[PDB]
Amino acid sequence: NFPNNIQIGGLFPNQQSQEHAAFRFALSQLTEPPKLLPQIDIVNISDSFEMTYRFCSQFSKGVYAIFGFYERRTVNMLTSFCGALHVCFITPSFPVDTSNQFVLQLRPELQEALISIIDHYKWQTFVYIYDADRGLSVLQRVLDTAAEKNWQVTAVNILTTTEEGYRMLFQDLEKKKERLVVVDCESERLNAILGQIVKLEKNGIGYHYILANLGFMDIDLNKFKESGANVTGFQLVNYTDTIPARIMQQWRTSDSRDKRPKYTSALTYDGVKVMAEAFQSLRRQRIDISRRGNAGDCLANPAVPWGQGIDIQRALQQVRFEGLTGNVQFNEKGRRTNYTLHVIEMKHDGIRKIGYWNEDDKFVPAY
Amino acid sequence: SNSIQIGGLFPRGADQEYSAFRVGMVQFSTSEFRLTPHIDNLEVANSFAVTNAFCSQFSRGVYAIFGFYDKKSVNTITSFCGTLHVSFITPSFPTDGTHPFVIQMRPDLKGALLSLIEYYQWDKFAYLYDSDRGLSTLQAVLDSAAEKKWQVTAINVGNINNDKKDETYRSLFQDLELKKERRVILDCERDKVNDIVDQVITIGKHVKGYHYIIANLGFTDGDLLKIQFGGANVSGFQIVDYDDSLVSKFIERWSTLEEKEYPGAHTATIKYTSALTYDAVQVMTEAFRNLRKQRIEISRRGNAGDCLANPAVPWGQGVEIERALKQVQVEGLSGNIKFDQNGKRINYTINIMELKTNGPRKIGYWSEVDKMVVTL
Amino acid sequence: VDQVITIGKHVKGYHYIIANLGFTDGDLLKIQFGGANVSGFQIVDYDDS
Ligand SMILES: *[C@@H]1O[C@H](CO)[C@@H](O[C@@H]2O[C@H](CO)[C@@H](O[C@@H]3O[C@H](CO)[C@@H](O)[C@H](O)[C@@H]3O)[C@H](O)[C@H]2NC(C)=O)[C@H](O)[C@H]1NC(C)=O
Ligand SMILES: *[C@@H]1O[C@H](CO)[C@@H](O[C@@H]2O[C@H](CO)[C@@H](O)[C@H](O)[C@H]2NC(C)=O)[C@H](O)[C@H]1NC(C)=O
Ligand SMILES: *[C@@H]1O[C@H](CO)[C@@H](O[C@@H]2O[C@H](CO)[C@@H](O)[C@H](O)[C@H]2NC(C)=O)[C@H](O)[C@H]1NC(C)=O
Ligand SMILES: *[C@@H]1O[C@H](CO)[C@@H](O[C@@H]2O[C@H](CO)[C@@H](O)[C@H](O)[C@H]2NC(C)=O)[C@H](O)[C@H]1NC(C)=O
Ligand SMILES: *[C@@H]1O[C@H](CO)[C@@H](O[C@@H]2O[C@H](CO)[C@@H](O)[C@H](O)[C@H]2NC(C)=O)[C@H](O)[C@H]1NC(C)=O
Ligand SMILES: *[C@@H]1O[C@H](CO)[C@@H](O)[C@H](O)[C@H]1NC(C)=O
C-alpha cells in the first residue's frame, strides 16, 4: 500500500530534555503502520547555516517530514526551504506572523488573547517586556492597538536591557500606585526574569503582572510566596481533564513501572499524533508515497520540489483530534485553529480561574 | 594585467546604483591594478538567494564583496562574512552591533535625528515607521522618549498593499485627526516618502501648522518642489553636499552620461545610495592600493573552495584586507570618509535642511562630536 | 482649478462658482476634498432615462 516505515527528521536544540522524552513516549504508543521512524539531529536551532546543513542532509536522506524547533534567527530559512522544497516542518515553537502552508505550528497564537486580557482590565499605561527572539511582530501588534485605544505602552526588549536598565524602569514604575507589567517570553528566559523582578519589587503591593505564556502552571510560582503581586496568565493544558489525565496516567506508569509535563512537551506529544494521524489519513485515502534514499541533492536553481510533498501537507493540515492540548486543528495557513485558552490568576497563591478565551467569543469570565 | 577580483551583489532594481558603481570603476581605475567586478543581480530580501550569491562569489575567489542587504538577509551577510573573513562593503543600513568584516559606507542617522527633534523643541509627535525597512531608529527615539520627555505616537506605514494605498494613507492622517497631531516624522525609503507626501498634499495637510521631518539621508533625492508652497515646515538630512567642488565636478560629468548606457544617470541630483556606491569604489581601490604600498601580499594561492566546507577555516589574509579597508581615509561624494574598528563611518557630517519657497536650504550640520550646529 | 489647488486655496473658507453650463463636464474629483464650496450649473441631467 505505502512504505512500512515513514522516516521523520528532527531538529532538536538539546541532547536531552523533556521534549525529547515526550517525543519518544508518543512514538512508543503508536501501533498501526506506517511506523514513524525518527532520525534526529542535535543542532543549534539559532544558526541558519547549521540549520541549512541538517535540513538538506535530512532532505537528502529521504525523510517525509521534519519535526523540530526554530528561533527568530532561523524562521526565514525554514519557511524558505520548506516552501521551496515542499517538505513540512511540524514545530511547537513560537508562531510567526507570515510563514507558509508547509510549516505546521502546534503552538496556538497568543496575541489576540493577550489584547483581550488588557482590554478586560481596562489598562491604559503599562510596561511591555518581550523576547527579541520571537516577539518583534507581536509588539507592533501591541503598538497598533495602543494607537487605537490610546494606550501609553513602554517597550522593553529582554535581550538588550541590563540589570540597571531594569532597576531604573522599576524605579519609574513605583512612582505611581498601580504598576502594570506585561511579560511575553518563553519559559526558560521567563524564570530568569522572575527572580530579577521579585527582588526589585519589594512588598509587591500594587503590582499587576500578565505573563504572555501558555504554561502558567509551569512557572516557579514560589518566587511569589507572600508577594502582593497580582499575576495573570494562560494555561493550555488541564491535567485533570479526561483525555489529558488518561494520557498523564499512561506515561506516569510508563516511567514508574520502568515531573509535570511542560506545555512544549505537551505540544511535542500532540505533534507526534498529528504526524501519525496525517500518514494514516494517507493510507485510507490510498495515496502512494515513496522517496529517494539516493541522496536527491538539496540546493539547486530552481529548487525542485518533492512532488508528493503537497499530499503530506494537505493531510497534516486536515488533522482533527483531541490531544494533551485540547482540540488539535489547523487553518489553511498552517496555524492552530478552534482552540480554547484558559485564563488563570494568582495572589498569595491565589490559583483562581478567571475564565477562558477562544477565537469566536474572545474572553468570557467564569458596611 | 593586475586583476583583483571582487563581487558585486546588486538588488534586482538598483539601476542608478549600478550606474554609479560603473562610473566609480572608471574614475578610480589605474595602471597599478584593475578591480575586476563579478556582478550578481538578486532578490536581496531572499536569504536563500543571498547565500547562493555569496557562496557563488566566494567560490570564484573574490577578494571582497561590494553589495546590499535587507533587514531579512543582513544576518546571512554578517555571519558568512564574519565566519569566512570576507569583507563586505555596503551602502545599506549600518548593522545593529559590531559585526566584523563589514564596511558600512552609510553613516548613522539616529544621533542627528534625535538632535533635530530636540532642536525644534518637540515634546509630542507622530512617528511614521516602515516595518519593511526596520524599526532600529524608532527604537532609539522610543528609548530616549522618557529622558527627553516626549510623547510619541508610532504608526506602522509598512504593510500597505499598493491596491489601496491612497485610502490607507488618507485614513492614517484622518486618524491623526484625533489627537491633533501636526508634528510628524517620516523615516521611510524615498519612494514611500513621495507616496506619503502625495497624500498629505491631496488631504491638504501641507499647510502652515504642520511640520514634517524626513528621516533619511537624502532630503533632496526626491521631489520637494510639490510640497514647497503649502506653508508646512519640512526638514531633513543630506550627506551629499552639492556645494562641494568634488561633488559639483562629479555631477557635471554625471549629468552628461548617456541615459541608455547609464540608467538613472542623466540628472542633476543623485540618490545618496548611489553616491555611497561610487564612494565605495574609491575605498576599495585605496584599500587594495595601500596593501601594495605596504608589500602585504594578499593573492590567494589555492581555490577559496566551498562556502560550506567543513571545518570552516578562514583564509589568512582576510584580516589584512579588512584592516586595510577600515584604515582608508578619503574625501568623496558623501564627504570625509573614515571608519572605526567596526567599520562604521566616523568623523562624518550630516547637513540639516529645511524646505523654503526658494527651495531646500542648509540650516546647519550635525557632527559626531559637535552634535547639532546652526549655520551662519 | 489646478492652480487654486497648488496654491492651497481649495480649502474651507473659499467658495467658487463655475459659470458655465457643464458643471460636471470637467474633473471635479481633484478639488472635492479640500473643503472649499464649489457650485455650478448643469443642463444635461444624467438622471433622465
Ligand atoms: C548558535 O548559533 C548562533 C549563530 O546563529 C550563535 O549566535 C551568536 O551568538 C553569540 C553568542 O550569544 C552572539 O554574540 C554575543 O553578541 C552579544 C551582543 O552583540 C555580544 O555582546 C556578546 O559579546 C556575544 O558576542 C552573536 O551575536 C550571535 N550571532 C548572530 C548572527 O546573532 C550562537 O552563539 C550559537 N550558539 C552555540 C552554543 O553554538
Ligand atoms: C487581581 O487583580 C485584579 C486587578 O484589579 C483584580 O480584578 C478586579 O476585581 C475587582 C473586584 O471584583 C473588579 O471590580 C475588577 O473588575 C477587576 N479589575 C481589573 C482592573 O481587572 C482581582 O480582584 C485580583 N485578584 C485577587 C485575588 O485579589
Ligand atoms: C470546534 O472544535 C470542536 C472540537 O471541540 C468541534 O466540536 C466537535 O465537533 C464534532 C464533529 O461534529 C462533534 O462530534 C463533537 O460533539 C464536538 N465536540 C465538542 C466538544 O463541542 C467543532 O465542530 C469545531 N468547530 C469548527 C468551526 O471547526
Ligand atoms: C514651523 O517653524 C517655526 C520656526 O521653527 C515654528 O515656530 C515659529 O517660530 C517661533 C519659535 O517658537 C514661534 O513662536 C512661532 O509661533 C512659530 N511661527 C509660526 C508662525 O507658527 C513653528 O511652530 C513650526 N510649525 C510647527 C507646526 O511646528
Ligand atoms: C460655504 O457654504 C456654507 C453654506 O452655504 C456657507 O455658510 C455656512 O452656513 C451658515 C449660513 O450662513 C453660516 O452661518 C456658517 O458659518 C457657514 N458654515 C461654515 C462652517 O462656514 C459658508 O460661508 C460658505 N463658505 C464661503 C466662504 O462662502
Ligand atoms: C481544568 O478543569 C478543572 C476542572 O474542575 C478546572 O478546575 C480548571 O479551572 C480547568 N482548567 C484551568 C486551566 O483552569
Q: What are phi and psi of A80, to 5 degrees?
A: -70, -45
Q: CA separation (Å) from B2 to A2, B25, B33, B64?
A: 62, 15, 5, 16
Nearest-Å Rg of the Cα atoms of chain C is: 12
Residue A89's DSSP bridge partners are: A66, A103
Characterize the bridge pairing of strands A35-42 and A5-12. Answer: parallel
Q: Contact C6/B229, CB-based, under 8 Å?
A: yes
User: What's the gap between Cα B195 and its chain centre?
Assistant: 20
CB contact under 8 A, C33 and B202: yes
Q: Do C34 and B204 touch (CB under 8 A)?
A: yes
Query: Is-contact A219 A211, C-beta < 8 A?
Result: yes
For residue B203, which residues of chain C lie inside 8 Å, CB to CB? 33
Resolution, given in Å to one decimal, reads: 6.3
Neighbours of chain C (3+ CB pairs under 8 A): B
Quick one: DSSP state of residue B94? P
Distance CA A178, CA A157 (A): 22
- Cβ(A216)–Cβ(A233) below 8 Å: yes
Smallest CA–CA separation between A251 and chain B, in Å?
Answer: 41
Could you give the CA distance from residue B342 to residue C47 in angstroms, rounded to a whole number?
72
Q: Which three cell numbers stand for residue C18?
A: 463655475
Which chain B residue lies closest to A169 (C-alpha atoms)?
Answer: B146
Residue B123 and residue B132 in contact, taking contact as beta carbons nearer than 8 Å: no
DSSP state of A89: E
**Rounded CA separation A70/B62 (Å):** 33
Give the bridge partners for A215, in sequence order: A235
Q: How far is it, in rounded angstroms, from Cα A187 to Cα B187? A: 35
Beta-carbon count within 10 A of A152 CB? 10
**CB of residue A230 inside a 6 A radius of ligand 2:** yes
- For A204, the grid coordinates are 509587591
Q: B89-101 in b/e burial notation, b at 16+ Cβ within 10 A?
A: bbbbbbbeeebbb
B138: CB partners within 8 A, 6+ apart: B127, B129, B154, B187
Q: Where are the beta strands (DSSP E) in chain B?
A: 3-11, 34-42, 65-67, 88-90, 102-104, 124-129, 151-156, 183-185, 211-213, 233-238, 330-332, 335-337, 349-356, 359-367, 371-374
**Chain B interface includes A60 (CB < 8 A):** no
Chain-chain contact of B47 with A48 (C-beta, under 8 angstroms): yes
- Output phi, psi for A178, to 5 deg: -110, 125
Give contacts of C10 with chain B, Cβ < 8 Å. Answer: 204
Distance, in Å, from the CA atom of B2 to the CA atom of A282, rounded to the nearest integer, reads: 62
Residues within a 6 A CB radius of ligand 1: A 44, 46-47, 73; B 75, 79, 97
The span from the CA of A298 to the CA of A60, in Å, is 6
How many angstroms away from the CA of C21 is the closest CA of chain B?
27
Question: Which residue of chain B has the CA closest to C35?
Answer: B204
Q: How far is the CA of B22 from the centre of ligand 1 (A)?
A: 37
The label of the residue with cell 501501533 reads A31
Torsion angle, CA of B132/B135/B137/B140, rounded to 10 degrees? 180
Residue A54 Cβ inside 6 Å of ligand 2? The answer reads no
Contacts of A53 in chain B (CB under 8 A): 308
Q: Which residues contact B14 (CB under 8 A, 6 or more apart)?
A: B68, B273
Report d(CA A152, CA B285) in Å as an integer: 51
Cα–Cα distance for residue pair B6/B290, rounded to 1 Å? 16
Nearest C-alpha neighbor of B50 from the set A133, A11, A48: A48
Given an 8 Å threshold on Cβ–Cβ distance, is B79 in contact with A49? yes
C-alpha A242/C-alpha A116 separation (Å) is: 28
The preferred substitution site among C15, C31, C38 for testing ligand 5, maximizing ligand atoms within 8 Å of CB, is: C15
Cβ within 8 Å, pair B75-A140: no
Q: Which helix (H) or strand (E) holds C15?
A: strand C15-17
Looking at residue B138, its amino acid is L
Pair A104, A89: CB distance under 8 Å? yes
- C-alpha cell of residue B218: 537624502
User: In a mutagenesis test of the C interface, which of B197, B198, B202, B226 is the best target, namely the one with the most C β-carbons within 10 Å?
Assistant: B202
Cell 506572523 locates to: A97
Chain A interface includes B56 (CB < 8 A): no
Specify the DSSP element, H or E, that contains A178.
Answer: none
Which residues from B are below 8 Å from A44, CB to CB? none
- Chain B interface disruption, residue of C6, C12, C27, most B CBs within 10 A: C6
Distance from CA of B48 to the nearest CA of A (A): 7
Question: Best substitution site from B72, B75, B77, B79 to test ligand 1's pocket, by max atoms within 8 Å of Cβ?
Answer: B79
Of the CA atoms within 13 Å of residue A164, those in its CB half-sphere come to 0
Q: How many H helices and E strands in chain C?
A: 1, 2
- Extract the C-alpha cell encoding A304: 525542485
- Kindly report each contact of residues B357-366 with a partner whose C-beta sits within 8 Å and lies 24 or more positions away, as own/partner: B357/B228, B357/B229, B359/B224, B359/B225, B359/B228, B360/B219, B360/B220, B360/B224, B360/B236, B360/B238, B362/B238, B362/B241, B362/B243, B363/B235, B366/B111, B366/B112, B366/B115, B366/B116, B366/B237
Q: How far is the CA of A354 from the centre of ligand 2 (A)?
A: 10
- Is residue A229 a contact partner of residue A209, using CB atoms and an 8 Å limit? yes
Q: Is the CB of A235 under 6 A from ligand 6?
A: yes
Grid cell locating A202 = 519589594
Please tell me the distance in Å from A132's CA to the nearest CA on chain B. Answer: 12
Which cell numbers in the block locate residue A257?
513501572
Task: Name which of A49, A73, A140 is nearest B131 (Cβ-Cβ).
Answer: A140
**With the C-alpha atoms ordered A245, A250, A253, A255, is the resulting torsion angle positive or negative?**
negative
Determine the Cα–Cα distance for residues B241 and B351; give it in Å rounded to an integer.
Answer: 8
Residue B241: closest CA among B211, B264, B267, B220: B220
Phi, psi (deg, nearest 5) at residue B89: -115, 125
Region of B94 (left: φ > 0; alpha: ψ -120 to 50; beta: rest) is: beta
Q: Rounded CA gap, B179 and B320, in Å?
A: 56
Amino acid identity, residue B30? T
B and C: touch, per 3+ CB pairs < 8 A? yes
Q: Is the peptide bond before A302 cis (omega within 30 degrees of 0)?
A: yes
Q: Are A238 and A342 in contact (CB under 8 A)?
A: yes
Experimental method: cryo-EM
Q: C34: CA distance to ligand 5 center in Å?
A: 15
Q: Which of B75, B98, B342 to mutate to test the pocket of ligand 1 (most atoms within 8 A of CB)?
A: B75
| Nearest residue on chain A to B139, alpha-carbon basis | A155
Q: Provide DSSP, A126-150.
A: EEEEE-TTTTTHHHHHHHHHHHHTT
Which ligand lies nearest the alpha carbon of A237? 6
Contact A156/B at CB under 8 A: no
CB neighbour class for A87 (10 Å; exposed up to 12, middle 13-18, buried from 19) = buried
Rounded CA-CA distance A243/A322 in Å is 7
Nearest residue in A to B50, CA atom: A77
Distance between CA atoms of residues A353 and B2, nearest Å: 76
- Which residues are B373's β-sheet partners? B365
Ligand at minimal distance from the CA of A242 is: 6
Closest-lying ligand 6 atom to the alpha carbon of residue A238: 1
Ligand 6 atom 1: the closest Cα is on which residue? A238
**DSSP-assigned letter for residue B369:** T
Q: Which residues contact residue B292 at a Cβ distance below 8 angstroms, ignoring those fewer than 6 apart?
A: B32, B33
- Looking from the CA of A315 toward its CB, the CA atoms found within 13 Å total 26
Sheet architecture: strand order including B65-67: B34-42, B3-11, B65-67, B88-90, B102-104
Does the beta-carbon distance from C34 to B231 stay under 8 Å? Answer: no
Beta bridge partners of C12: none
Q: Answer whether A124 touches B (CB < 8 Å).
A: no
Give CA separation, B135 vs A161, B114, B141, B169, B188, in Å. 17, 15, 10, 19, 11
Short-list A113, A120, A94, CA closest to A105: A94
Atom nearest to A74 CA in ligand 1: 5
H helices of chain A, in order, are 18-29, 48-61, 75-85, 111-120, 137-148, 163-173, 187-201, 242-257, 263-284, 309-317
| Identity at B312, one-letter amino acid code | A
Per-residue buried b or exposed e for A175-194, using 16+ beta carbons within 10 Å of the residue's own CB? eeeebbbbbbbbeeebeebb
Contact B156 A140 (CB under 8 A): yes
Cβ pair B179:A155 closer than 8 A: no
Helix (H) or strand (E) holding A356: strand A352-358
